[PDB]
Amino acid sequence: KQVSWKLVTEYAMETKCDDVLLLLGMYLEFQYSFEMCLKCIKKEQPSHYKYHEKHYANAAIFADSKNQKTICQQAVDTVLAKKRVDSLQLTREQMLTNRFNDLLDRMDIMFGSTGSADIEEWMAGVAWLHCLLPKMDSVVYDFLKCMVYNIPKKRYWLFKGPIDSGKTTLAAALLELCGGKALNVNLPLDRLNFELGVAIDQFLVVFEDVKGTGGESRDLPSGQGINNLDNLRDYLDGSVKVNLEKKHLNKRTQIFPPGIVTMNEYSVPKTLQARFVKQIDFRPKDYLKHCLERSEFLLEKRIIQSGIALLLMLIWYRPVAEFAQSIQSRIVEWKERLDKEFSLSVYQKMKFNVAMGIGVLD
Amino acid sequence: KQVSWKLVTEYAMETKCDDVLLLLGMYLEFQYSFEMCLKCIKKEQPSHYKYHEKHYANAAIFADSKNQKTICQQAVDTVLAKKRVDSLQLTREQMLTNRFNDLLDRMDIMFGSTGSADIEEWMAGVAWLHCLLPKMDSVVYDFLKCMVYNIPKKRYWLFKGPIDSGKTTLAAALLELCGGKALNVNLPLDRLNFELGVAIDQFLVVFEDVKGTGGESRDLPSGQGINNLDNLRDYLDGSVKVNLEKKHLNKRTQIFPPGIVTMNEYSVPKTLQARFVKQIDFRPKDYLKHCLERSEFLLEKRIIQSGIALLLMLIWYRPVAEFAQSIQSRIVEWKERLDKEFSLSVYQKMKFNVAMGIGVLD
Amino acid sequence: KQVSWKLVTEYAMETKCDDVLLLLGMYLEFQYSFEMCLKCIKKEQPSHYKYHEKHYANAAIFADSKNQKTICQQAVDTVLAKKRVDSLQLTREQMLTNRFNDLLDRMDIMFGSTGSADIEEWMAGVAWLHCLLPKMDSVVYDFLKCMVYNIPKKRYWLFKGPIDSGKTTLAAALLELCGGKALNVNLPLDRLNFELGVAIDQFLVVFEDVKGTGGESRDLPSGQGINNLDNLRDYLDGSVKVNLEKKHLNKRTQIFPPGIVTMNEYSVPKTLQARFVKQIDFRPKDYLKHCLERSEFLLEKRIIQSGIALLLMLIWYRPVAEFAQSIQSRIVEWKERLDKEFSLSVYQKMKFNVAMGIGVLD
Amino acid sequence: KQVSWKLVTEYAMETKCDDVLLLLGMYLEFQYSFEMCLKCIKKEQPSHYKYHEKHYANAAIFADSKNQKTICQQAVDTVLAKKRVDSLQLTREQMLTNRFNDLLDRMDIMFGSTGSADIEEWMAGVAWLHCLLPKMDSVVYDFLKCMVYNIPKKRYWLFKGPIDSGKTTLAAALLELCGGKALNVNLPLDRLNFELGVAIDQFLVVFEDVKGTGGESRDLPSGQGINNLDNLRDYLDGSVKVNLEKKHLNKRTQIFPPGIVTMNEYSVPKTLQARFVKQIDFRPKDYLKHCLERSEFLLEKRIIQSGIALLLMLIWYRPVAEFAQSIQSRIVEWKERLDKEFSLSVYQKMKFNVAMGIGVLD
Amino acid sequence: KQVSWKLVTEYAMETKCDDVLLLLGMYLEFQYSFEMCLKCIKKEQPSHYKYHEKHYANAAIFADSKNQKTICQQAVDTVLAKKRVDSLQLTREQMLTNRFNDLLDRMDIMFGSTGSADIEEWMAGVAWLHCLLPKMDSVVYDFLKCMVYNIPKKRYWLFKGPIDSGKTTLAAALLELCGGKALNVNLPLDRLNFELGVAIDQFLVVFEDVKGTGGESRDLPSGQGINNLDNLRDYLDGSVKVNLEKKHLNKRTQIFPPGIVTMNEYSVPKTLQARFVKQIDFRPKDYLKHCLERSEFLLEKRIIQSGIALLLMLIWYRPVAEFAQSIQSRIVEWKERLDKEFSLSVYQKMKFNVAMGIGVLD
DNA sequence: TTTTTTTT
Ligand SMILES: Nc1ncnc2c1ncn2[C@@H]1O[C@H](COP(=O)(O)OP(=O)(O)OP(=O)(O)O)[C@@H](O)[C@H]1O
Ligand SMILES: Nc1ncnc2c1ncn2[C@@H]1O[C@H](COP(=O)(O)OP(=O)(O)OP(=O)(O)O)[C@@H](O)[C@H]1O
Ligand SMILES: Nc1ncnc2c1ncn2[C@@H]1O[C@H](COP(=O)(O)OP(=O)(O)OP(=O)(O)O)[C@@H](O)[C@H]1O
Ligand SMILES: Nc1ncnc2c1ncn2[C@@H]1O[C@H](COP(=O)(O)OP(=O)(O)OP(=O)(O)O)[C@@H](O)[C@H]1O
Ligand SMILES: Nc1ncnc2c1ncn2[C@@H]1O[C@H](COP(=O)(O)OP(=O)(O)OP(=O)(O)O)[C@@H](O)[C@H]1O
């Protein structure tokens, strides 16, 4: 009796798996008796224990197959095709709406009955971020609109401030929220070709702390980052489709996605300054160090640098109407949970703790 | 029973889909019962909702196949082969009349019963564009003619001027009209070969804001595109059918397309200066800026970037007889629709507001 | 009758082999009779003698196969797929627990009846290592925790001091204790792309002997490793997923691992100094040298380089509670075995000899 | 029944089609009933209507094939192999035969229905050139035979003349007529090796003018090209095969092609002078330049830079017997055309205007 | 009837061939009638004449196969697989023992009844080599043990002395005896990367003729050799692994081999001096020069270059117990042959003749 | 074949 390639394809689709080796490895686990499957019994990974019983019979036949890599390749191609279809047909707002549903599904696990992390430590992170900048949640909402609208040559925000000002942290949290990638531009112009190939078919890019020049006056070690970017004015502008690499693969032509750039304070030529729409300034604050020095669980669990914390911040602060119409129900549900789990006075206490630079909890 | 590769290819031809993943993805959507297909019901995408009912049976059998990518390969190659054969056997006029028919087909939908575009917003775009330079439509006709005639060493026009002067904006609309390609050559000489590969079988090309030299006198940092163009002068002359390249494929002898260049004001070498039909200056004009600042929905919807605005402009400004012959029926049909929609007062009231710097729709 | 590919995949899994040639070459040995197999009878090599008699009949049929490399390719893929799955799903603690289990398995062999090693020689090395720094075992525990926790920015330790202060000796031991590989970044900037590719999916990294510049005053030969490092600033921070490259392969995206930097007494930019948690300051000492001269069986058997030596140190000094819970069973048996062999007086006698600069043994 | 691979290959040979996508594209068109075929009915392309009826039955079966691209690949190989075989049998006269037979077919466009500049203007260019210097038609036939005979040392002619002597304009027409390539030699020797390799396997070359070593003694730019050339002794002579050097590729070796040199009027060494077969000698003349200033459409059409004007000139002046035996059959036809087009008195009146300095077409 | 792939693989294993083309061509020769085979009858190559009779039948079927290169690939894979198994599993003593067996086999041919060599001339070779240094046979035995033990730090030997004082002669014979490859470090650092790639999987390396700097004080050409070496202190001391790279290959990681460094009288930094176990002085001795001048068959047959001569020297001088236990039987057999064919007095006479600087033989 | 190497 033969393998159902259809069952494999369905698993890959349902998992959103898009690496042939992950798919291969994952599917093989299901060859063993699901009844005794310790991973199921431990409820260890949902992408396993939800599926093992259903896929078990087909995995036993797959384990004998001579074709295995070919079956997995087709399944991965089906997932990749779905992404391309979506990218060409969804509005950007639907893309974000889908991305939000996925994060909310994780939150249903994180704070589920399994309760693998506690909502107090997570909510504590929100207060720390809210203190990081003035009017923080307003700044986040502006950024989301900007990325969704994707207005030509109004597409990039510049983060500037000293070392350890917090700019990388905020970028990292935003990048998780929207989904996207970081790219290193402090590199030679040749291999840079394939670096940009990474950006194919994605929502955001982040360029990290690109080195400028002449800042060694202030001991900013100089480098090609700024020179490199100014070759790519068109990529930022987003007025024209551009052609993107991959190894052993032909060009893809598409608009280069919007994003943000982080900078210790080298100088900027005005060709490039003209292309940022908004610069934000970041500053060291010792009481914030002191808070972290006590509340080190924030860093160990990477709470403050994670997009989940930004979503929780938005849920706490924004009217339900500001969310895309479909998810508004799930937002109401989480607003209710949060209002139930915390008084405002508790949140005010946490903010005061952060302000005092004591550990967030007392 | 067995997949009809014939029916697959027929859909590929009819959508003009020419990507193997895009084709693969979309055809798989047809495997479900079209009678409940929410996309059909909701009339979301014509590339789906027209074809689903027809292709359904074959798509179910396709969904079972083990050959899927290979089927899509042969289908795509038929689409590309049509393009190549058509590329040789048609006159540039016939090419352009095909392109215009395609855009007219979109417009028939965009202002159709779905009608999601306001004609008057779109016409406000036309006003802004014809306001950008005198006799805008007339210079557009001169450009179109020059590209149809495609005369050796009279095949390129230069746009030169400072940032935010609109040169990029105009190139976008022309390129969206003509169906060409952008290329970037601010790059290491040896690497450009596959970038030039994109020029295979294109009506037109555009080079964006190429890096020159000596402009750092004025904060324009130097780069190689200037020298690259000098070496590429062979293609710019377009005397002979150069053998263009693409990965894992045979190379392709053809005449290099004509095109446009945009420039912030670096030096020009005499040899490059020698090669143009024409130069055009571009000049920041604050009253337009003040208008857009109110009227920003124009730019949000990219109206002023989009060739559909130019086509509406030429329908408005130009004689029916100025168009190529066979389309002149559709020209009249659309001329009538504009004539039905507008008083000249409405247009003039708008163009007044544009000249002032008011919200165009006051 | 036909090859069982399943038996080959089992052998690959059981040996954890991931070279197609090594797998092939070993599997082919099983085709002769195990009953006369002199390697079995000499019981020379465990990856052979455990398995020959099981695999025998399938090896004989495999010897006749026309497909041999395809069979091995599928088997090696399964072992590679297993690693990929684990690299997503295991905790860093659980990885380290696995790594320990395998070293402990080699320790069971080395000190077995096969008796390739003298535990007294190996314990001598622990005395030399524990003498090299204050509170040596505490330093190892703090480092291991740091690598398990992987706290952003707080990820890297800097080793510096004169040449011949044992810094690379110590780095080697840690690197063998964990998983990982070394890297040399004094390179030209372009080849660096493939240098960093080595880090993919690994646990530790060690940057080896980074040349600074300006050290020529201290007679240090000079180079660009430090300036290269300050370009890789985000790789140290580990705050966001970077892109990594191998020859003929698409870029992987992942967090760059934590690790150690070794150098002589150059200076370091603030941007890079800010990225080290801890700076260990090694010193030349004569008694270590004069002891080691009279103790050269240490170097001749590579004892003080090797991870097995550090593991013996931890088993001696650290409480059973400090190990991950599942290995505490094996740890207790090894603790018993050690004390059954060595009195404290014997160990202190060894440390006394080292402190005296006498040959460790007496 | 089944696709005849035989018939597909016949068409590829008969059309000399040597691109797999074109072959695929065109052959697919035959699948419709030729009896109705509108392309046949309108005689639009011979490459179609010559063949459709014969190939139709095979094309119907071809359209159902699942191997289609593979059939076309084998067919294209056959055509490429034919070129490969013949490339090793070409006499230089047989080579020349084709290289003009090609241009006669191109000229079936030049004054076909395309007719894109006046056959009058084209002969007016011929008029203007024929009175630059003596007997120009004979001079072409002589230079032509020189390049076909390729007699060692007896292979190179020199254009000596000041700035604006026309030698560059002439050189344009020469390479245009004949093929070959232009080259520089004023590089530093350090560079020049690769530049010399560029000539590899061209039938002919031009050298762009040496900037005289000490040439500015004449008020003409100084440079290195003199000593560079006379150091390149043997390349000129073609006595023996020489090594040649492509960038990024290994050596090749070949008899160095014959050709042409341009010079402004520098201090040619006796040795360097002795290399040449024939100086030709050029200076400003007033009827010429003032006629240009009155015939400027010829420069705008660059006809006076045109080798096609030279081919036209030979077609006019020279005996039929001077052309190779069979290709002669075409030249009479263009003469017949040109004679029906023009009396002598026309070409006379044109020539008179040039001699008078009058605008040639007056 | 079928081809036996097994018989081909046996021949490949038997001949140790690992080039597919060399394997292919040789097997095809067996298809002609062994019963008349001229190559057999001339006894030209053992690799042919030993096997033709055996493989004749299979080669006849092989000659008709359509799969020929596919068969050879699997065969060559088997030989490469054998090498990689051996590469990991053998001891360094086992490796050398195998190497010795190979030379002993070649000697059995060279001096056989078919033997084209002269055992007396090769014995004259041993006399000249034994004269080149003090204690020569004791010195060789010391060098070998050093390579077999591969003790870190204690790994490398330095040769120095004038030009034409024999150093590379000895290096070449040692390199032939052990196997290994020579390296050139007198480079800029960029190419040095692929240079070291040669060392992968070698038993020995020789650093030929390292240029110091400042030897120009005494007319030695200055260069970057020594300066490049002292970067690589880890590579010599061999305590820890290094990364190694070849063109088009992913990096490997291993202990860098032991080896020899050679120079004229350049100055040596003490940093480098401490790297070496031993330094051997060579001095030009005129009686050797006059002996070669009268004993030219030594040079012309390359006798004194050959590792076979050093092997003969070991066989003649060393006690049987010094060889690896397995080969001691062959050593006894060769010692018997040599003691039979040469008296001690005769060998001593040759040694006396070399001391006289007269020709070796009388 | 591309890529990597070459090239700078
Ligand atoms: N505003 C702040 N005040 C004090 N400490 C801060 C602040 N922001 C960040 N930190 C500390 O700095 C560390 C690094 O933050 P982050 O990487 O976001 O800064 P950055 O300015 O982007 O730095 P860099 O340019 O070096 O990447 C944080 O983990 C936290 O410990
Ligand atoms: N003539 C103009 N006057 C004022 N604003 C202008 C003008 N043209 C363009 N703009 C503004 O400049 C923005 C960018 O226009 P565009 O990219 O076409 O200019 P550009 O001259 O090509 O610039 P750059 O050289 O920086 O790419 C537009 O979105 C619009 O907001
Ligand atoms: N603290 C010490 N005092 C004196 N000698 C030492 C000390 N530590 C190591 N040694 C000696 O130094 C030798 C080399 O050690 P190692 O290679 O680790 O030195 P290193 O200074 O860390 O080297 P590098 O800087 O080149 O990596 C050891 O084999 C030992 O002989
Ligand atoms: N025979 C001629 N008589 C007068 N003017 C001439 C003649 N030939 C060319 N010209 C003038 O010379 C100008 C440049 O022509 P061309 O480049 O062909 O000359 P050249 O001698 O090769 O020049 P250069 O050495 O400067 O490159 C033409 O545009 C024309 O004005
Ligand atoms: N000890 C010696 N006394 C005299 N002549 C010698 C001696 N050794 C070598 N020769 C002569 O020197 C020639 C070259 O020897 P060899 O190539 O080994 O020299 P080298 O000094 O090691 O060279 P290099 O350093 O250039 O590689 C030999 O062929 C022989 O003629």
Cα–Cα distances in angstroms (integers) from residue A283 to residues A76, A100, A264, A280, D359, in the given order: 45, 30, 11, 10, 76
Length reported for chain E: 362
DSSP code for B179: T
DSSP code for E250: -
Length reported for chain A: 362
**For B62-91, what is the HEC assignment?**
HHHCCCHHHHHHHHHHHHHHHHHHHHHHCC
Strand partners, C205: C181, C259
In the numeric block, the tokens 């002979």 are attached to: B240
Question: What is the whole-number distance in angstroms between the Cα of residue B118 and the centre of ligand 2?
Answer: 24
Strand partners, A281: A160
- Other C-beta atoms lying within 10 Å of the C-beta of residue A217: 8
Bridge-based pairing of strands A242-246 and A249-254 is: antiparallel
Distance CA E358, CA E350 (A): 10
> Helix, strand or coil for residue B297?
helix
Listed residue (B231, B227, B173, B247) closest to B204, CA to CA: B173
Give backbone dihedrals phi and psi of B183, rounded to 5 degrees, phi first: -140, 145
Nucleotides of F under 7 A from a protein CB: 1-8
> Helix, strand or coil for residue E279?
strand
In the numeric block, the tokens 């991870």 are attached to: C307
Say if the Cβ atoms of A242 and B169 lie within 8 Å: no
- The residues, any chain, with a CB within 8 Å of residue A26's CB and separated by 6 or more, are A11, A15, A17, A47, A48, C85
DSSP code for D210: P
Residue A160 contacts residue A263 (beta carbons within 8 Å)? yes
Q: Is A163 annotated as a binding residue?
A: yes
Listed residue (E59, E86, E90, E75) closest to E20, CA to CA: E75
Say if the Cβ atoms of C241 and A181 lie within 8 Å: yes
Give backbone dihedrals phi and psi of D358, rounded to 5 degrees, phi first: -75, 150
Q: If 0-12 CB within 10 Å is exposed, 13-18 middle and 19+ buried, where does residue D235 land?
A: middle
Distance CA C176, CA C173 (A): 5
Distance CA D303, CA B151 (A): 13
> Helix, strand or coil for residue E245?
coil
DSSP code for B154: B
Q: Hey, which residues 296-325 in chain B have their CB within 8 Å of chain A?
A: 299-300, 302, 305
**Maximum distance among all Cα pairs of chain A, rounded to whole angstroms:** 73
In the numeric block, the tokens 């998810």 are attached to: A327
Cα–Cα distances in angstroms (integers) from residue C76 to residues A19, C12, C18, C69, in the given order: 17, 7, 5, 10
- What resolution does the deposited structure have, in angstroms? 3.0
D64 Cβ under 8 Å from any chain B Cβ: yes
Kind and range of the H or E element at D253?
Answer: strand D251-254
In the numeric block, the tokens 């893929």 are attached to: C77
Listed residue (A226, A300, A316) closest to A263, CA to CA: A226
Cα–Cα distances in angstroms (integers) from residue A284 to residues A261, A307, A352, E271, in the given order: 19, 22, 19, 46
Strand partners, C158: C261, C279
A270 Cβ under 8 Å from any chain B Cβ: yes
Q: Which ligand is nearest to the CA of E232?
A: 3
Distance CA D105, CA D102 (A): 5
- The residues, any chain, with a CB within 8 Å of residue A196's CB and separated by 6 or more, are A183, A235, A244, A245
* Helix B344-356 / helix B119-132 crossing angle, nearest 10 deg: 50
Distance CA D72, CA D254 (A): 34
Say if the Cβ atoms of A172 and C5 lie within 8 Å: no
Residue nearest to nucleotide F6 (CA to C1'): D248
Bridge-based pairing of strands E259-263 and E205-207 is: parallel
Dig out the tokens for A173 from the structure.
Answer: 């949290």
Q: If 0-12 CB within 10 Å is exposed, 13-18 middle and 19+ buried, where does residue C16 land?
A: exposed
A287 Cβ under 8 Å from any chain B Cβ: no
Residue D360 contacts residue D126 (beta carbons within 8 Å)? no
Dig out the tokens for D131 from the structure.
Answer: 């009175």
Distance CA E202, CA E181 (A): 7
> Helix, strand or coil for residue E72?
helix
Cα–Cα distances in angstroms (integers) from residue D20 to residues A236, A241, A251, E289, in the given order: 38, 29, 21, 70
Residue A30 contacts residue A59 (beta carbons within 8 Å)? yes
Cα–Cα distances in angstroms (integers) from residue A108 to residues A325, A332, B288, in the given order: 20, 14, 50
Dig out the tokens for E70 from the structure.
Answer: 């596919």
**For chain A, what is the HEC assignment?**
CCCCHHHHHHHHHHHCCCCHHHHHHHHHHCCCCCCCCHHHHHCCCHHHHCCHHHHHHHHHHHHHCCCHHHHHHHHHHHHHHHHHHHHHHCCHHHHHHHHHHHHHHHHHHHCCCCCCCCHHHHHHHHHHHHHHCCCHHHHHHHHHHHHHHCECCECEEEEECCCCCCHHHHHHHHHHHHCCEEECCCCCCCCHHHHHHCCCCCCCEEECCCCCCCHHHHCCCCCCHHHHHHCCHHHHHCCCCEEEEECCEEEEEECCCCEEEEECCCCCCHHHHCCEEEEEECCCCHHHHHHHHHCCHHHHCCHHHCHHHHHHHHHHHCCHHHCCHHHHHHHHHHHHHHHHHCCHHHHHHHHHHHHHCCCCCC
Q: What angle do CA B194, A261, B227 make, to 5 degrees?
A: 35
Dig out the tokens for D144 from the structure.
Answer: 């032509």
- The residues, any chain, with a CB within 8 Å of residue D53's CB and separated by 6 or more, are D34, D40
Residue E182 contacts residue E205 (beta carbons within 8 Å)? yes
Q: Which ligand is nearest to the CA of E240?
A: 3
The amino acid present at E59, given as its one-letter code, is: A
Say if the Cβ atoms of A221 and C227 lie within 8 Å: yes
- Between CA B247 and C1' F2 the distance (Å) reads 8
Q: If 0-12 CB within 10 Å is exposed, 13-18 middle and 19+ buried, where does residue A202 land?
A: middle
Listed residue (D4, D65, D57) closest to D31, CA to CA: D57
Listed residue (E104, E40, E92) closest to E337, CA to CA: E104
Distance CA C290, CA C236 (A): 38
- Between CA A145 and C1' F1 the distance (Å) reads 44
Cα–Cα distances in angstroms (integers) from residue D286 to residues B182, D263, D281, D351, in the given order: 46, 21, 16, 15
Dig out the tokens for D122 from the structure.
Answer: 């084209």
Residue A31 contacts residue A48 (beta carbons within 8 Å)? no
The amino acid present at A54, given as its one-letter code, is: K
Distance CA E355, CA D349 (A): 103
- The residues, any chain, with a CB within 8 Å of residue C324's CB and separated by 6 or more, are C93, C94, C96, C97, C100
Dig out the tokens for C231 from the structure.
Answer: 């370009």
Distance CA C36, CA E210 (A): 52
Q: Please name the residue of chain C whose CA is at the shortest distance from the CA of residue E71.
A: C66
Q: What was the elucidation method? A: cryo-EM
Distance CA B228, CA A13 (A): 45
Nearest CA to ligand 3 atom 27: C168
> Helix, strand or coil for residue D256?
coil
Residue A5 contacts residue A74 (beta carbons within 8 Å)? yes
- The residues, any chain, with a CB within 8 Å of residue E33's CB and separated by 6 or more, are E56
Distance CA C89, CA D224 (A): 68
Bridge-based pairing of strands A242-246 and A205-207 is: unpaired
Distance CA D131, CA A321 (A): 85
Q: Is the CB of A152 under 6 A from ligand 2?
A: yes
Strand partners, E280: E159
Cα–Cα distances in angstroms (integers) from residue D89 to residues D94, D204, D217, in the given order: 9, 19, 50
Listed residue (A86, D225, C102) closest to B48, CA to CA: A86
Distance in angstroms between the alpha carbons of the first and the last residue of chain C: 64
Distance CA A80, CA A23 (A): 13
Q: In A, which residues are within 8 Å of B187 by CB distance?
A: 189, 231
Residue A148 contacts residue A100 (beta carbons within 8 Å)? no
Distance CA B280, CA B159 (A): 5
Please tell me the number of Cα atoms within 13 Å of B221 on its side-chain side. 17
Distance CA A127, CA D60 (A): 72
Tell me the nearest-neighbour CA distance from D41 into chain B, angstroms. Answer: 16
> Helix, strand or coil for residue E179?
coil
Dig out the tokens for C219 from the structure.
Answer: 């007679």
The DSSP annotation for C219-284 comes to T----SHHHHHHHSHHHHH--S-EEE--TTSPPEEEPPPPEEEEE-S----HHHHTTEEEEEE---
Distance CA E2, CA E269 (A): 67
Give CA A322 to chain center in angstroms.
Answer: 21
Residue D34 contacts residue D40 (beta carbons within 8 Å)? yes
Distance CA D109, CA B7 (A): 40
Q: In A, which residues are within 8 Å of C269 by CB distance?
A: 219, 221
- The residues, any chain, with a CB within 8 Å of residue B112's CB and separated by 6 or more, are none
Q: Please name the residue of chain A whose CA is at the shortest distance from the CA of residue B305.
A: A239
